């Protein structure tokens, strides 16, 4: 089968997209590698919708307005490994989605609450953006994401009031930007013991309580910024291996002379090389030099 | 360099999306092959935005508030094949756009006028997306595809009154759905002598003139739906590749026995694989049986 009408493909790749298509065309090659079909007006996946697609490898399906996936929808999709539906009506996280998945974008969408075996079935996981969705805390839900080696998660844009406790221990990345999180306390941090970046930016941390950020032994970006913060959090000079954190626009009043170098030189420690701290209630002035000695260069502290 | 914050990436395959970045982040690997940042806040392309990207093969800029790209902004991009800026404030059809480049996708936009030597440059060029777009065509300017041996072209939705006539003649597929295009006349598809598709659907032509549609040789889809039709357009019987014409929702009245099929049928000739003409004021009690001899199943008649 060559290609649905305003398409245009070539070599396995099926280029679909701004046609406003009804639903998937029923003409698509099984050859087929890619199936790019984003901007149209799809609102829902029926059983056989992809009939005999199992070369499938990437399928984006973002800004569309799909609203009921059929269960046995993607079950023809066995080498599937890209699934992007962000920007659509979904209301629940699809299930049975294909073990071969690597990525999964599901941004914008409207996903009120995630269940427990939903992610059940997947081993092959390492992406998920589930932003620009409305759930609150309450809305996951004990063992949600159960079972699932997965290093990378981002659900920033959402209706979290703290951080998430039951994720995967194996994240190394975590995102939880633009929420309305209220602080970060004790145990919060404390199974997520292998993270590179933790963002946290544009939150609402009022008070991040100590040794919390402690259980991040190998953490080298932290931002923390745009928040309600008062002081520098604590623990940032016994974190070995923070190379960038980043605090401007908070709350913060005064930086105590050890706010970030720890007292007595080690080497298992890293130099800053980025710090930010401009946009708070304390100038230039009141910052002895001091204060950043194992910062690199001067140009790694906007401030 | 590993990469920017929001971003996950791996194997050379920078994914930055929906972190509403406010431009194009400078953290960015030389061996990347992939740069996905869409819908973020980009505003603009600055001169080194990208440099040193080399390896660029497809970036992806859609869903972004750009308005402004420099000059020089593009030439780090030695191997760039895809460019997709859709949905953007762009102003302009960019220029010295890499001659690598093979599909080009700007659509959703606000260029209101493409002059000539746009084009001049690429040589590997064959798909362009224009649509969404207010371009009427007073906009465009003799010689603007000049010299542009491609073969895909989609100006949708735009503000056409009527069939460009200076486009490629290379031209292979060309849709210009959704516009307000007047009516097909004579000369209007004289050079396109090369096409398997041409989309007029959702239009306003009142009237296409005979003879106009013999320039098209080998013709296999036809879509013409959605306008001001009165008669089955003249020509369709000589049209030896004719598979597929789809005439519904027009104003077509009276449907005579010889409009499709032609008049001392072959051997080597052509089977319609379906007509539409649902939607329109003639019942199917009012055209003869005889009018879709040449037809194959029934189930090819939606009518
Ligand atoms: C900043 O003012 C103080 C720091 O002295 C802090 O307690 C408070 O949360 C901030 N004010 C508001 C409501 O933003
Ligand atoms: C269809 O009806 C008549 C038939 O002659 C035609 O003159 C006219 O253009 C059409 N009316 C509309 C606007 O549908």
Redesign the interface.
């Known amino acids: 089968a060559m290609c649905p009408?305003?398409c245009?493909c070539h070599l396995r790749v099926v280029?679909c997209?701004?046609?406003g298509l009804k639903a998937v065309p029923k003409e698509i090659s099984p050859d087929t590698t890619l199936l790019d079909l984003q901007?149209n007006d799809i609102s829902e996946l029926r059983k056989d919708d992809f009939k005999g697609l199992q070369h499938l490898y990437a399928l984006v399906l973002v800004?569309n307005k799909i609203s009921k996936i059929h269960e046995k929808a993607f079950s023809p999709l066995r080498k599937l490994q890209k699934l992007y539906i962000?920007?659509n009506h979904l209301v629940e996280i699809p299930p049975n989605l294909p073990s071969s998945l690597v990525?999964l974008?599901i941004?914008?969408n409207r996903i009120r609450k995630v269940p427990k075996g939903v992610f059940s079935g997947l081993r092959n996981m390492?992406?998920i953006?589930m932003?620009?969705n409305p759930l609150e805390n309450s809305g996951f839900e004990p063992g949600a994401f159960d079972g699932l080696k997965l290093n990378?998660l981002?659900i920033?844009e959402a209706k979290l009031t703290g951080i998430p406790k039951d994720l995967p221990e194996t994240l190394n990345?975590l995102?939880l930007?633009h929420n309305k999180i209220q602080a970060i306390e004790l145990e919060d941090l404390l199974r997520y013991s292998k993270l590179y970046?933790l963002?946290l930016g544009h939150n609402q941390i009022r008070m991040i309580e100590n040794g919390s950020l402690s259980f991040l032994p190998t953490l080298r970006?932290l931002?923390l910024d745009n928040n309600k913060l008062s002081r520098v959090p604590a623990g940032l000079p016994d974190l070995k291996l923070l190379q960038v954190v980043y605090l401007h626009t908070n709350n913060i009043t005064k930086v105590g002379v050890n706010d970030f170098c720890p007292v007595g030189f080690g080497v298992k420690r890293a130099y800053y090389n980025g710090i930010s701290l401009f946009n708070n209630p304390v100038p230039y002035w009141e910052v002895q030099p001091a204060t950043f000695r194992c910062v690199t260069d001067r140009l790694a502290i906007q401030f």
Chains 1, 2 share one sequence.
């Open positions: 009408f305003g245009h280029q997209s701004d046609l901007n800004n962000s920007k990525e974008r941004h914008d390492n992406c953006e932003g620009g990378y981002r920033s990345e995102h930007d970046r963002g970006e931002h």
